[PDB]
Amino acid sequence: CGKTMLAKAVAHHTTAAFIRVVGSEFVQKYLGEGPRMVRDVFRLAKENAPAIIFIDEIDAIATKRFDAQTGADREVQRILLELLNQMDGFDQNVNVKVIMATNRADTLDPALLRPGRLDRKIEFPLPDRRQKRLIFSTIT
Amino acid sequence: LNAKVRLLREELQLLQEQGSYVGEVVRAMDKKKVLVKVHPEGKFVVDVDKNIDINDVTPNCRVALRNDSYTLHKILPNKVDPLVSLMMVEKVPDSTYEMIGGLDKQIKEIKEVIELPVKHPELFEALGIAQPKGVLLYGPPGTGKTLLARAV
Amino acid sequence: QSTYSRQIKQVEDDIQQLLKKINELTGIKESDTGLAPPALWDLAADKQTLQSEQPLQVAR
Amino acid sequence: TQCRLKLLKLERIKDYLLMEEEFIRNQEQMKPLEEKQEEERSKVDDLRGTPMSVGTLEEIIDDNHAIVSTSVGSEHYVSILSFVDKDLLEPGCSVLLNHKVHAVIGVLMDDTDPLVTVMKVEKAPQETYADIGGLDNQIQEIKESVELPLTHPEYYEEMGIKPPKGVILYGPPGTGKTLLAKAVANQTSATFLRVVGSELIQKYLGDGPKLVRELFRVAEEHAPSIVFIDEIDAIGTKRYDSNSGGEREIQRTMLELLNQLDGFDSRGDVKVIMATNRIETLDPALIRPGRIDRKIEFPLPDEKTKKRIFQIHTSRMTLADDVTLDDLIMAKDDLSGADIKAICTEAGLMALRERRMKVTNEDFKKSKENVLYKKQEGTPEGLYL
Amino acid sequence: MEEGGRDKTPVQSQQPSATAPSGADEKSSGKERRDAGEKDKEQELSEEDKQLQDELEMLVERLGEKDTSLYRPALEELRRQIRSSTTSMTSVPKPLKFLRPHYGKLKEIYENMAPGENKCFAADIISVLAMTMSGERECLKYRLVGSQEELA
Numbered sequence: 008c009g010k011t012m013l014a015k016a017v018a019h020h021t022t023a024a025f026i027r028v029v030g031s032e033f034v035q036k037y038l039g040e041g042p043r044m045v046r047d048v049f050r051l052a053k054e055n056a057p058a059i060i061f062i063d064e065i066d067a068i069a070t071k072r073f074d075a076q077t078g079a080d081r082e083v084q085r086i087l088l089e090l091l092n093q094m095d096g097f098d099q100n101v102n103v104k105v106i107m108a109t110n111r112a113d114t115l116d117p118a119l120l121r122p123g124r125l126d127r128k129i130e131f132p133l134p135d136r137r138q139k140r141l142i143f144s145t146i147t
Numbered sequence: 148l149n150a151k152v153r154l155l156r157e158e159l160q161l162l163q164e165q166g167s168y169v170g171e172v173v174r175a176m177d178k179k180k181v182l183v184k185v186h187p188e189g190k191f192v193v194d195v196d197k198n199i200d201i202n203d204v205t206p207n208c209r210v211a212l213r214n215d216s217y218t219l220h221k222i223l224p225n226k227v228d229p230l231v232s233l234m235m236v237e238k239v240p241d242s243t244y245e246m247i248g249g250l251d252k253q254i255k256e257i258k259e260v261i262e263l264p265v266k267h268p269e270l271f272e273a274l275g276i277a278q279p280k281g282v283l284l285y286g287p288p289g290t291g292k293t294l295l296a297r298a299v
Numbered sequence: 300q301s302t303y304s305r306q307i308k309q310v311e312d313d314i315q316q317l318l319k320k321i322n323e324l325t326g327i328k329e330s331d332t333g334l335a336p337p338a339l340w341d342l343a344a345d346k347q348t349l350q351s352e353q354p355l356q357v358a359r
Numbered sequence: 360t361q362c363r364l365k366l367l368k369l370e371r372i373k374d375y376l377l378m379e380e381e382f383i384r385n386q387e388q389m390k391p392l393e394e395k396q397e398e399e400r401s402k403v404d405d406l407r408g409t410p411m412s413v414g415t416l417e418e419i420i421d422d423n424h425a426i427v428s429t430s431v432g433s434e435h436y437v438s439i440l441s442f443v444d445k446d447l448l449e450p451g452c453s454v455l456l457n458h459k460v461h462a463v464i465g466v467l468m469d470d471t472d473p474l475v476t477v478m479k480v481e482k483a484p485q486e487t488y489a490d491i492g493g494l495d496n497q498i499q500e501i502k503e504s505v506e507l508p509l510t511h512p513e514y515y516e517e518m519g520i521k522p523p524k525g526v527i528l529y530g531p532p533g534t535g536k537t538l539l540a541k542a543v544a545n546q547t548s549a550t551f552l553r554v555v556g557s558e559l560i561q562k563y564l565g566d567g568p569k570l571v572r573e574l575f576r577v578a579e580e581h582a583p584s585i586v587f588i589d590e591i592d593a594i595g596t597k598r599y600d601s602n603s604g605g606e607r608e609i610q611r612t613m614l615e616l617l618n619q620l621d622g623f624d625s626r627g628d629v630k631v632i633m634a635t636n637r638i639e640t641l642d643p644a645l646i647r648p649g650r651i652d653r654k655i656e657f658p659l660p661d662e663k664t665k666k667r668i669f670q671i672h673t674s675r676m677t678l679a680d681d682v683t684l685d686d687l688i689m690a691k692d693d694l695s696g697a698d699i700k701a702i703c704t705e706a707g708l709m710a711l712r713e714r715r716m717k718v719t720n721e722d723f724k725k726s727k728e729n730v731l732y733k734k735q736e737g738t739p740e741g742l743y744l
Numbered sequence: 745m746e747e748g749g750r751d752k753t754p755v756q757s758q759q760p761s762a763t764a765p766s767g768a769d770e771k772s773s774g775k776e777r778r779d780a781g782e783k784d785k786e787q788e789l790s791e792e793d794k795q796l797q798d799e800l801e802m803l804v805e806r807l808g809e810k811d812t813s814l815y816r817p818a819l820e821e822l823r824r825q826i827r828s829s830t831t832s833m834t835s836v837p838k839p840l841k842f843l844r845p846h847y848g849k850l851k852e853i854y855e856n857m858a859p860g861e862n863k864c865f866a867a868d869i870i871s872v873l874a875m876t877m878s879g880e881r882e883c884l885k886y887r888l889v890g891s892q893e894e895l896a
Contacts, residue, residue: 301854301864301866302864304863305860
């Protein structure tokens with residue numbers, strides 16, 4: 008429904024830096040690099056502020072389930088813990104929080120992320136008669 | 148104006164001197180040299196400078212280095228640590244027990260546990276056996292553990 | 300109990316300063332080991348120090 | 360108690376005298392006037408330039424040449440340019456090299472690396488037997504194996520029994536594994552080396568095994584020494600897994616530790632106190648009896664043992680003296696040695712919460728319950744399912 | 745605490761007594777030191793005498809509101825006083841009685857508060873008073889041994 012498209016349209020309007028990363032870019036590049044990279048991206052945006060931080064994917068990062076019996080999971084479970092934190096430190100200042108895209112609402116946690124840590128949590132209508140009327144009207 | 152001319156001129160020669168790094172004096176040796184552990188490069192044993200010595204620099208202290216000769220310059224209390232990067236985002240803490248909580252019981256219960264061992268740890272040691280171990284804040288996100296930690 | 304307690308505070312400051320001194324106590328001298336025959340040795344060593352052609356690197 | 364306080368009066372005078380006395384002896388009053396003495400001080404200044412590079416001596420040959428690895432650039436085939444002889448040198452040592460010409464000026468420093476600095480917590484703890492919260496019998500097992508052959512060889516020779524090369528402590532955890540290691544270490548008044556197992560795990564290639572063997576070398580120069588390998592299982596059989604660079608790493612650092620302690624025989628070079636929080640669910644690849652002989656198992660304190668741990672504790676505390684120690688123990692149910700310690704500490708802190716200064720009979724009762732509750736919620740309670 | 749606004753007796757106190765010990769005892773600080781030392785005037789020593797019964801009672805409430813923060817700001821200065829230095833040795837009938845509760849205040853600071861400083865300040869005041877008082881002092885120690893509330 009072009010949920011991400013909206014994030015593109017506002018990003019362009021600002022005429023400022025945009026730092027856009029994927030979930031895969033947060034996790035390692037030399038093994039164990041991955042949590043360090045999480046700190047780096049957010050701070051880099053503050054140096055060149057106004058700026059936007061966008062995360063396309065958190066499909067395996069915001070999931071509650073993790074092991075450590077699986078070596079791979081260890082970096083990922085850290086990326087989630089650091090992301091909760093960033094939201095705390097950001098508050099009572101002029102730093103805007105993380106803007107994110109996901110497929111569903113059941114991948115994210117229901118008791119670690121919740122509203123008034125992200126002002127607006129927006130669902131896009133699955134039924135929407137009018138939205139479709141607008142798609143046909145471009146053709147008109 | 149003489150002074151300004153001089154500052155630039157001295158600045159130019161003083162600076163040209165190649166290299167100037169940082170190390171840490173992990174330890175000192177009986178050869179009245181100190182071991183420097185250069186942080187992304189080879190370790191180097193150097194003589195004490197006339198600016199600072201073994202008496203002046205205690206172990207596991209961060210230091211400045213001058214030249215390609217890795218001679219001592221100044222003492223640095225700072226060290227590159229992820230803690231430093233975590234502070235930048237943290238900024239300035241906020242909140243109090245009252246805002247978060249609301250009830251007079253909540254504020255009393257956190258307050259006694261935490262505050263008093265920082266004020267006097269010697270007392271606590273005496274009080275039981277040894278010094279009080281970790282403490283655990285737990286609750287629903289309707290007390291908010293990291294936020295409380297900033298209020299404390 | 301009481302009389303001792305003040306001795307405790309003072310002794311800690313003493314120990315701090317002493318930790319630096321062990322280095323000196325072991326020797327101010329820069330030397331490790333040396334006997335009168337490595338003096339002869341030393342004249343030869345000097346040239347090897349002088350020249351940058353030596354020391355010899357290991358390569359494979 | 361009284362004795363401990365007295366030792367401090369002598370030590371206060373001692374620091375002052377030792378600092379003045381040091382000065383006349385070390386030199387600049389015992390300034391080299393001797394052909395041997397002057398020759399070493401003067402010659403090393405002349406050969407030496409500044410900077411220098413540290414190296415570790417990889418192997419020596421008997422024709423007055425040796426091979427070293429310097430921290431910077433390549434390795435060097437260096438000569439023994441004056442000073443130290445062949446015998447003095449040994450591989451695995453750190454030696455000082457002049458950059459102008461890399462050669463071994465010497466060692467007399469018992470190495471010098473950043474690695475050694477972490478290893479040497481050399482100055483002993485004030486912790487000692489029966490300053491511990493421990494069981495009387497359990498400390499006296501640690502002492503029998505590790506400490507006793509050095510102190511009295513007499514008993515071991517007459518008896519005809521073999522001295523070990525270390526010992527191993529394993530849990531049920533919360534038994535003062537680390538406290539025991541520190542108690543014995545003060546008593547010998549031999550240098551106490553310490554390293555944590557995770558430091559030896561790394562995602563770099565090959566670095567780990569150098570450190571593991573290195574612990575035994577540093578200790579040997581200092582010797583007698585006791586080498587404290589905190590959480591051995593960490594290098595060993597507890598996971599770093601197979602998908603983070605653990606796949607290669609763990610197996611090598613674990614194996615490397617296991618072969619030297621075993622040797623080809625029980626070497627008996629330097630004593631070791633190894634602490635582990637369990638060998639209960641973990642895999643085999645660890646040191647077995649008859650190289651370190653005695654392996655020490657801890658129980659989970661019963662009523663009778665709890666008397667020994669508690670009496671030590673009640674002395675610093677107060678107003679659990681009024682009420683009989685025996686009755687207090689009986690009342691409380693079975694718990695581990697850290698738990699027992701925790702009740703007692705918590706008694707002192709909970710009085711402050713009550714609005715009282717310090718432990719009373721009432722505060723002591725409540726603290727018992729709180730810890731017990733944590734455990735009772737965590738793991739199975741009473742009556743079958 | 746040398747104030748004529750009542751902290752001490754320029755006239756018979758009763759109001760600050762209950763109030764002050766909870767937060768940190770302000771009443772007894774000025775009363776024992778300042779009043780005794782400035783005026784060894786005997787008509788003024790009689791007001792203190794009447795006050796004395798009240799003074800005894802102060803010890804049980806004071807043991808109720810124990811807690812390291814409440815106790816630490818309240819007394820550092822009682823610890824310091826010497827009787828011969830206030831020259832209150834030179835009237836025996838009424839100051840001797842004032843010493844009876846004065847001791848009971850000090851003992852809580854001495855051991856319970858564990859740090860080295862509290863013991864050493866506290867030593868100087870007990871000794872001078874004890875030798876001068878003797879016979880009555882032996883009775884005073886016994887009363888303390890029993891304790892007003894049987895706690896730590």
